[PDB]
Amino acid sequence: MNPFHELEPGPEVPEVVYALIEIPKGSRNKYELDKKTGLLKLDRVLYSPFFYPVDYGIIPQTWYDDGDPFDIMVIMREPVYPLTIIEARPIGIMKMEDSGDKDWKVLAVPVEDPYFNDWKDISDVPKAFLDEIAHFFQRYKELQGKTTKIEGWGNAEEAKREILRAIEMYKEKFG
């Protein structure tokens, strides 16, 4: 059973989506879902001593402009295990390009951690934290010779619009 295809995008789209976590915060190993089987697979070991600053995964039943499931980053105090489902509230979106591809990523908080009850938009996140995430994506592939361009951060409304676009793109590609 491939979780990417089997799970709905969320219980109350786009206000609450499912995040299917692939990479826990603190990992230098970059995991992805095997397309065929839906098992966790090692994509690569990051070439530099950086760690994922957030729990990182995908939204089920989405497709994006870069030809992959739509990425989501969830701020967790204690990281989860790979292949864990988290009910997440989108609060913003990171706009970036990776080798000419649109590789934007939703930023979200868990609905069921009261610590984040008042985080509802991109302005609620400490600025240094947004910078640390952006810097990670700016440099994590530098030793692989890849250039990424960070364009900036969009707000919750923009994140939600993009989620709806990605849901539609999945329906068209696979429907």
Please give the single-letter amino acid code of residue 75: I
Tokens of 123: 């302005």
Binding partner at 42 among Ca ion, its own copies, none, C-beta below 5 to 8 Å by kind: its own copies
Question: Per the structure block, which two tokens stand in for 31?
Answer: 């995991």
Contact partner, 120, from Ca ion, its own copies, none, Cβ < 5-8 Å per class: none
**29 vs 148, which CB is nearer to its own copies?**
29
Q: Cα 1 vs. chain centroid, distance in angstroms?
A: 22
Shorter beta-carbon distance to its own copies: residue 77 or 173: 77
Region class of 151: left (phi > 0), else alpha (psi between -120 and 50), else beta: alpha
Between residues 87 and 157, which has the closer beta carbon with respect to its own copies? 87
Rule CB under 5 A: which residues touch Ca ion? 66, 68, 71, 103
Residues making contact with its own copies (CB under 8 A)? 1, 3, 6-7, 20, 27-29, 31, 34, 37, 39-45, 47-53, 76-78, 80-87, 110, 112-118, 126-129, 131-133, 135-136, 139, 142-143
Backbone angles phi, psi at 131, to 5 degrees: -60, -40
Residue 66 near which of Ca ion, its own copies, none (CB within 5-8 Å, type-dependent)? Ca ion
**55 has which bridge partners?**
74
Nearer to Ca ion, 116 or 170 (CB): 170
Least Cα distance to 5 among 35, 41, 40 occurs for 35
Residue 95 · residue 123 · CB < 8 Å: no
For residue 71, the partner it binds in Ca ion, its own copies, none, with Cβ less than 5 to 8 A by kind, is Ca ion
